[PDB]
Design a protein around this nucleic acid. Structure first.
Lengths: 95, 80, 98, 106, 198, 82, 97, 95, 109, 198, 198, 198
DNA sequence: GGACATGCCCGGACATGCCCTATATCTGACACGTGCCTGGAGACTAGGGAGTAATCCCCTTGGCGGTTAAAACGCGGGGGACAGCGCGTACGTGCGTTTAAGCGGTGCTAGAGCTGTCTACGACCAATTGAGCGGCCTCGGCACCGGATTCTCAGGCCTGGCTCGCGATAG
DNA sequence: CTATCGCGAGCCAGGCCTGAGAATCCGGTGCCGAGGCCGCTCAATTGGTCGTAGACAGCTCTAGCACCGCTTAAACGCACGTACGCGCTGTCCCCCGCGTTTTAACCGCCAAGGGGATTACTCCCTAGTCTCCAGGCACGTGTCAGATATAGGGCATGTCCGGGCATGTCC
C-alpha cells in the first residue's frame, strides 16, 4: 500500500482522445513517464531560473511561456503557446 | 542584405589560422559564413527572448551571457 | 629576383603570430551590422549594448577557432592538409550540431 | 460537490498535481494560479503529438500496440522532436534503418 | 514338327481342371476369358492368370507345362513361335529365350524347353499346392506376339495346352483353351461371341 | 575478488555493436581500443553511482542512482525511473 | 559449395540487428566486469537487477552511437574499414578525449 | 552613488596576497575570476539541492555539499577540497 | 556585548561565510541550510581560487609579467589536466588558445 | 524372391490377433484403418500404431516380425523395397537400412533383416506383454515410401504380414492387413469404401 | 546414317525431270500417282513405272540411282530398310539383297549398293536414252514393304530420291517423290487428297 | 556447379535465332511451344524439334550445344540431371549416358559432355547448313525426365540454353527457352497462358 | 470392292500428388474494477510582491572627418589533392568444437523501506555595527613604441673526390 | 689489332662562409587603469524563541546473492580466399604569397534622446490554514488476443483406356 506518483490515467485518457484503439506496454509506459518527468523538470527549472534572474519570486504564466519558447522548436513552440494561451484564457473566464 | 560580405575573406582566414589550419580551400569561406550565421540565429533568438521577457527594448550583455550559458558554452568576462 | 618564401613558411608564421596573441581578428563594425540585420528578422527596431556585441564577437571567434581546430584534426586524420566543406560538415555532424 | 480546475479547463493532465509538484520542487516561494495550468496544457499537447506519431508508426508496422521501437521511430523521424530530444536515449528504441549511400553495392 | 501334341482333355487321377477370372468385355481389358468359346482374349505381354484346380494334391516334383499349337489342322505341324520382329526386339526378361511365345511371369524356377525331337517350345514350372486354407493355384502367363503378327502366328488361332506332369514328364492331366492375343480383347471377344449367333 | 573480467566482453559482441552502429568491416586491432573506451565509461558512471549510494547511506546501488548518474553526465537514460 | 560474396552477410546482419531491439552484450560477463571495476571503488557492493540492466542499456547505446560516428568518419576518408585512429578521432571530436 | 553590487573582488585579492604577495590583478582578469567563482557556486549549490531533493531531505547540510564537490571536482582536487572542508568545519565547530 | 568577529575569520578563510550563506538562503535551493554548508563551500571555492591563481602567477612570471591578465588565466586553466577537465566547456574571453602544432604540419628535411 | 511368405491368418496357441485405432476419415489424418477392407491408410514416415492382442502371454524371447509383400499374385515374388529416390535421400534414423520400407519407431532393440535365402526385408522387435492399463501391446510402424513411388511399389497394393515368432524364428502366430501409403489417407479410405458399393 | 542425302530438285544441264502414268484411283489400283501431293501410292512388290525425261541426252556411262529416306526430319537419319519379316521371307529375285526396300524389275544390269560410309541402300541402273519413237525412258521399281510394316517403315512416310549421276557417281540431276506403299492405293490416295481440303 | 552458364540472348555475327513448330494445345500434344511464355511443353522422351535459323552460314566445324539450368536463381548452381529412378531404368539409346536429361535423337555424331570443371552436362552435334532451298536446320531433342520427377527436377522449371560454337568451343551465338516436361503439354500450356491474365 | 479385321493414338477423366487456407484451441500477457486515504478543491485571511507612474541620467545611436591598416584583386607557381594501379595482408565467411550464457527452482539473509520519538538545529526577528561597496586620487605596470644588437638558418660558391672516357703501350 | 691500364677531365656532393631576416634588448615617455583610502549603509552577527525534521531504534519483508542442473546457442579456433588499405606515381589546378590599389574600420569628437534603473504608492494575488471529499493508486479477478496446428479445401499434374481412326485383307 505504498502510494506512488505516475501520470498513467492521464496519459491513457490523452491516448484514447487521439487514438481510442491503441494500447501501451509496461516498458512503453515507463518510457512515457520518464519523458514527461524529464520535460517537466527541464521546463520548471528554466522557468525558475528565468524568474530568479529577473528578481521575480512568483511563478507566473509569462515565465512559463518564455521557457516554452526557449525549449521547444519552432512549430512546437508556436502550437504549444497557442494551446496554452487558449486554455488559460478559457480557464480564467470560467474561474 | 549584403552585410554577410563584411566578414571578409581575410577575416575567415585569420579565424582559421587561430584554429591551426595551414591551407584553406576556396569553398571554405561560404561554408564558414553559413555556420556563423546559423550560430547567430540561435544565439540572438535566445538573447532577444530574454530581453522581451524583461520588458526591455535593448539586448544587454547579460542577455547574451545567459544565451551563451544556455547554449552550452559559458562565457566569462561580461558579468554574472 | 625578389625574395619569395616557399608555400607554408609564411602560413606557419601567421599561425604562430595569431596563436601567441589574444586581440580580436574579425572586424567590429561589419559584424555589428550583420548582428543588427539578423536581429530585425526576429524583432524590428532592436537595440544592442556595446558590451553585448563585444560578447557576441568573443563568443563567435572562440566558436570558430574551436571548430577550425576540430576541422584541422579531421583533415589530418584523412592524411590531408587543406580543409574543405565536407571537413566542416563532418566536424559539425560528429559534434552533434547537425 | 467538488469540480477540478482541469475539468473547468477541458484538459486531461491534473492541475492540482502539477501545482503541488511545482510548490514542492523548491523552485520559488510563490506560484501563480495560471502557471500550472499552462504547464499542464503544454504537457498534454506534447504527449498528444508523440502518441499521434507513435500510433502512426505502429499502424505502418501493422501493430495495434505502441512499443518502444515505435517511440524511437516517432522521435527520430520528426525533425523538431529529434531536436528537442537530441541528447535523450530511449531504452529498447534501437536506431533508424539508415545506410550511407557510399556503402551500398555498385 | 515331326508330331502334334495331343489336345484331349484329361482330368486324370487328380481331377485336374482349369479356371479363369470373370473379367468383363471392356474394349481393351488386358485379359478376358470366354466360357462360350473356351477362349482367352489378351493383350501382348500382359498378365494372363490361369487357375489350376485339382480334386487331390499331386506329389512333390509335379510340374505344370504350357505349349501353344495352331488350332487349324493344316497348321498343326508348324511350331508356334514369335515373329521375326518381336524375336529381335529387346524385351527378354532375362529368363525367357527371345523366340518363345509363352512366358511365365514371377517365377524364378521357370524352365524353357526347346524340344530336340519335336522342335516344340514350352514353359514349365513346379506345381505348388494351394495353401491348405485355399482352393486353387494361379499361374501367370504372358503371350509375346499378337495373333496377327506377320511372319509369326499371322492371324492363325492357337490353342494353349496345359499339362500336369510328374518329375519325369509323365502325363498326369491335360487341359486346353483357345487364345487370341490382340489389341482390344473386350471388343474382339464380344465380336466372336455375337458371331456365334450367325 | 573478480579478476580479468574484461575478457568477458567478447570479440563477436563488439562486432554486433558495430553492426548496429552501421559498421561493415572491423579491423582486428579495434577490440582493445573499444574495451578501453568501455572501461573508461564504466569507471566514470560507476563512480557517480557509488557516490550517490554512499551519500544515501546505502550499500546497494539502485537503478535511480545509475539513471541520475547518467543524467548528470548528459547521457540521460529513459526507462528505469525519472 | 555455395559461398556468399564479402559484404552481403555483413549488411544482412546490420539490417537484422537494427530492425530488432534485443540486447547484444551478454548479461553475465557485463555484470562481472561491472562488479570487478566496483571492487576498486567500494567494497562488497550489491547491485540491483534493474541497475545492471540500466548500465547495459547505457553502454550499448553509447557504443552503438560511437560506432555510428566512427563509421561516418571512416567513410569520410573514402574508407570502409574502421581503425583505432577512427575511434580516437570520433572521441576527440565528441570532446571526451 | 549606484545600487549595492556585490562581488568577490576583495576576497580574491586577499587569497592572491596569501598565495602571491607581490602579484596584482587586472580588471578583466578579476572579472574572469568572479565569473569562475559564481559558476562553481551555481554548479555546487544546484547539485547539492538536487541531491537533497532526491533523498527527501529538507535541510541543507555539509554531506550533500561534500558529495557534490566530489562529483564535480576531479580526483586529487576532490580529496584536497574535502580535507580542507572537514578541517575547517571541525575547527569552526570547536568555536 | 561580545566583540563582533566573522565566521570566515573563525574558519581561517577569506571568502565571506555570511555572504555565501545569504546567497544559499536566497538562491531558492532549500528552505533550510546548515551552518557548515557555507563554510565547506567557501573552503572549496578558496582552494580552487588559490590553485588557479598559483598557476596563473607561474605563467605570468614565465612571461616576465607581474600582473595577471586573461591570457595567463587561460594558459593556467588549459595547462592543468584537472582544471581543464573541470572547465572543459568554458571559454575565457581574451584568453586565446594553447600554442600547438600537429606533427604532420611541420616541415620535413 | 525364390519364395512367397504365407499370409494365412493363424491365431495359434496364444490367440494372437491384431487391433487398430478408431481414427476417422478426415483431412490431416496420418493413419486410419478400414475394418471393411482390412486395410490401413497412412502417410509416409508417419506413426502407424498396430495393437498386438493375445489370449495368453507367449514365452520370454518371443519376437514380433513385420514384412511387406505385393498383394497381386503376379507381383508376389517381387521383393517390396523403397524406390531409388527415397533409398538415396537422407532420412535414415540411424537404425534402419535405407532400402527398408517398414521401420519400427521408438524401439532400441529393433532388428532389420535382409534374408540371405529369400531376399526379403523384415523388421523384428522383442514381444513385450501389455502395459498396466491395457489388454494389448502397441507397436509403431513407419512406412517409408508412398504406394505410388515410381521405381518402388509403383501403385501396387501391399500386405503387411505380422508374425509372432520364437527365438529360432519358429511360427507362433500370423496376421496381416492391406496397406496404402498415400498423401490423403482419409480421402482415399472413403473412396475405396464407396467403391465397394460399385 | 552419319548423313542425310540432299532432296533438292536439280534438273541440271540435261533438263532432268520425272513423269508418271495417269492411273486413276480404283481402291485396288496397283500404282497411282498424285500430282497434287507429288506422291506415288503403290502395292507391295507391284510394278511402279517412273519416267525419266531429259531435254538432252546425257553421256554413255550415265547411271540412274534410287534411294529412299524418311520424310519427317526426326527420322531422316534412320536408314530405310525392309522389316524383319519381309527381310526373312523368301522373295528375293536372285538379284536384290533381302533387306533392300527398293528393287528394279526387268534389268540384268541392276546394281544394289550398301554404302560403306553412309549405310544407305540404293539401286542403280545404266541410263538408256528412250527407244526410238519414245520421248522418255521408263524404269520399273518395286517396293518390298508396306509403309505400315512394323519394325520397318512403321507407318512413316518416305521419299524416293532419283539421281542422275556420272560414271564416278557425281551428281548430274535430282528429283524426288513421296511414296506410300499400301494395300489400297486408290482408297488411300483419295483420302489424302480429300484431307488437303481439311 | 562452381559457375552458372550465361543465358543472355546473343544472335552474334551469323544472326543466330531459334524457331519452333506451330503445334496447338490439344491436351496431350507431344511437343508444343508457347510464344507468349517462350516455353516449350513436351512429353518425356518424345521428339522436340528446335529450328536453328541463321542470317549467314557459320564455318564448317561449327557445333550446336544444348544445356539445361534451373530457372529460379536459388537453384541455378545445381546441376540439372535425371532423377534416380530414370537414371537407373534401362532406356539408354546406346549413345547417351543414363544421367543426362537432354538427348539428341537421330544423330550418329552426337557427343555427350560431362564438364570436368563446371560439372554441367551438355549434348553437342555438328552444325549442318540447310540445302540452298531450305531456310533452317532442325535438331530433335528428347527430355528424359518430367519436370516433376522427385529427386530430379522436383517440379522446378528449367531453361534450355542453345549455343552455337566454333570447333574450339568458342561462343558464336546463344539463345534459350523455358521447358516443362509433363504428361499433358496442351493442358499445361493453356493453364500457364491463362494464368498470365491473373 | 465393299465389308470387315485389327492395331494404334489420344482426349477424357480419374488417380492421387502437394500446397493452401481457415478455424479452433491453447497459452501468455494484458484492460478494468474496488476500496480507501490522502492529496486536491472551496473559502477566508493577511501581507508583501508586483504593477504602474514619474524622474533622471547614462549609455546607446547617429553623424563628420581623416587615415591608415586592412581588404580586394592579379598573377605566377608549386605543392598538394586526387585519380589510377599494384600488392599483400588482414578481415570476412563458413564449419566443427566447446564453452558458458540463459532459464527455472530454491534459500536465505542482508538490507531497503516504513513507522515512532524526540531532540538538536535551522527559520525568524529585532538591535547593532562593522564589513564591503561607491567614489576619488595617484603612481607604476608595462606596453607602446622605436631603434640598435644579436644572431640562426638558408643559400651559394668552391673544393675535393669519384667515375668515365680516351689514349697509349704491350702482347 | 685488340685489350688493359693509367691519367685527365668533368660532374656531383658536401662543407663553409656570408648575408639577411627575425628576434632580443635597451631606453624612453607616458598614460590610464589598478591599488589604496575614506565615507556610508545595509547586511551579517548575536541573542533568543519555537516548530520540525531527520537521526536513531526497531520491525517487516523484498529482492539480491548464491547454487545446481540442463540445454543450446553463442563464442572460438582455424582454413581460405579475396577485397581493401596503403604505398607509389603522375597530373593539373587552385591556393599561397606578394605587389598594388582601394575602402572602410577605427579613433576621436560631439549631440541627442530614450529607455533602463530607481523610488513611491497601491492593490490584488498567492501562501497559509481549515474542512471536506473525490480521484488516484496498491490489490486483484478474469479475459482477450495471437500464434500454431489441424480440418477443410483447393490446385498440381501422372496414368489408363474407350473411342475412333488407320490400314490390311479377301471371298
Amino acid at each position: 500500500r505504498s502510494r506512488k506518483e505516475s501520470y498513467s490515467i492521464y496519459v491513457y485518457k490523452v491516448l484514447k482522445q487521439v487514438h481510442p484503439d491503441t494500447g501501451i506496454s509496461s516498458k512503453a509506459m515507463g518510457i512515457m513517464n520518464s519523458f514527461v518527468n524529464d520535460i517537466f523538470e527541464r521546463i520548471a527549472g528554466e522557468a525558475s531560473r528565468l524568474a530568479h534572474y529577473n528578481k521575480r519570486s512568483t511563478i507566473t504564466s509569462r515565465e512559463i511561456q518564455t521557457a516554452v519558447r526557449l525549449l521547444l522548436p519552432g512549430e512546437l513552440a508556436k502550437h504549444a503557446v497557442s494551446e496554452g494561451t487558449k486554455a488559460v484564457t478559457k480557464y480564467t473566464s470560467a474561474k | 542584405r549584403d552585410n554577410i560580405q563584411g566578414i571578409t575573406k581575410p577575416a575567415i582566414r585569420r579565424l582559421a589560422r587561430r584554429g591551426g589550419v595551414k591551407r584553406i580551400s576556396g569553398l571554405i569561406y561560404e561554408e564558414t559564413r553559413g555556420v556563423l550565421k546559423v550560430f547567430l540565429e540561435n544565439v540572438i533568438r535566445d538573447a532577444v527572448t530574454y530581453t522581451e521577457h524583461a520588458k526591455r527594448k535593448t539586448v544587454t550583455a547579460m542577455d547574451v551571457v545567459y544565451a551563451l550559458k544556455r547554449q552550452g558554452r559559458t562565457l566569462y568576462g561580461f558579468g554574472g | 629576383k625578389p625574395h619569395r618564401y616557399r608555400p607554408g613558411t609564411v602560413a606557419l608564421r601567421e599561425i604562430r603570430r595569431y596563436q601567441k596573441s589574444t586581440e580580436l581578428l574579425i572586424r567590429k563594425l561589419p559584424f555589428q551590422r550583420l548582428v543588427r540585420e539578423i536581429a530585425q528578422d526576429f524583432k524590428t527596431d532592436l537595440r544592442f549594448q556595446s558590451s553585448a556585441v563585444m560578447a557576441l564577437q568573443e563568443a563567435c571567434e572562440a566558436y570558430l577557432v574551436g571548430l577550425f581546430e576540430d576541422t584541422n584534426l579531421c583533415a589530418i586524420h584523412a592524411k590531408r592538409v587543406t580543409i574543405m566543406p565536407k571537413d566542416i560538415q563532418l566536424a559539425r555532424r560528429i559534434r552533434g550540431e547537425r | 460537490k467538488a469540480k477540478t480546475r482541469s475539468s473547468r479547463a477541458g484538459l486531461q493532465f491534473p492541475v492540482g498535481r502539477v501545482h503541488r509538484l511545482l510548490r514542492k520542487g523548491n523552485y520559488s516561494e510563490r506560484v501563480g494560479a495560471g502557471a500550472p495550468v499552462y504547464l499542464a496544457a503544454v504537457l498534454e499537447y506534447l504527449t498528444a503529438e508523440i502518441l499521434e506519431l507513435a500510433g502512426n508508426a505502429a499502424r505502418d508496422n501493422k501493430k495495434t500496440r505502441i512499443i518502444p521501437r515505435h517511440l524511437q521511430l516517432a522521435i527520430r523521424n520528426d525533425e523538431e522532436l529529434n531536436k528537442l530530444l537530441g541528447r535523450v536515449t530511449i531504452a529498447q528504441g534501437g536506431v533508424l534503418p539508415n545506410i550511407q549511400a557510399v556503402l551500398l553495392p555498385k | 514338327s515331326s508330331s502334334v501334341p495331343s489336345q484331349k482333355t484329361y482330368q486324370g487321377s487328380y481331377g485336374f481342371r482349369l479356371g479363369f477370372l470373370h473379367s468383363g468385355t471392356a474394349k481393351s481389358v488386358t485379359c478376358t476369358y470366354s466360357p462360350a468359346l473356351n477362349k482367352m482374349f489378351c493383350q501382348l505381354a500382359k498378365t494372363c492368370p490361369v487357375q489350376l484346380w485339382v480334386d487331390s494334391t499331386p506329389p512333390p516334383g509335379t510340374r505344370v507345362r504350357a505349349m501353344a499349337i495352331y488350332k487349324q489342322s493344316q497348321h498343326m505341324t508348324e511350331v508356334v513361335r514369335r515373329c521375326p520382329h518381336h524375336e529381335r526386339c529387346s524385351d527378354s526378361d532375362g529368363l525367357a529365350p527371345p523366340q518363345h511365345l509363352i512366358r511365365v511371369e514371377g517365377n524364378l524356377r521357370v524352365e524353357y524347353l526347346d524340344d530336340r525331337n519335336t522342335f516344340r517350345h514350352s514353359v514349365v514350372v513346379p506345381y505348388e499346392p494351394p495353401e491348405v486354407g485355399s482352393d486353387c493355384t494361379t499361374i501367370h502367363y504372358n503371350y509375346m506376339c499378337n495373333s496377327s503378327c506377320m511372319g509369326g502366328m499371322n492371324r492363325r488361332p492357337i490353342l494353349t495346352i496345359i499339362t500336369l506332369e510328374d518329375s519325369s514328364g509323365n502325363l498326369l492331366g491335360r487341359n486346353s483353351f483357345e487364345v487370341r492375343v490382340c489389341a482390344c480383347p473386350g471388343r474382339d471377344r464380344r465380336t466372336e461371341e455375337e458371331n456365334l449367333r450367325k
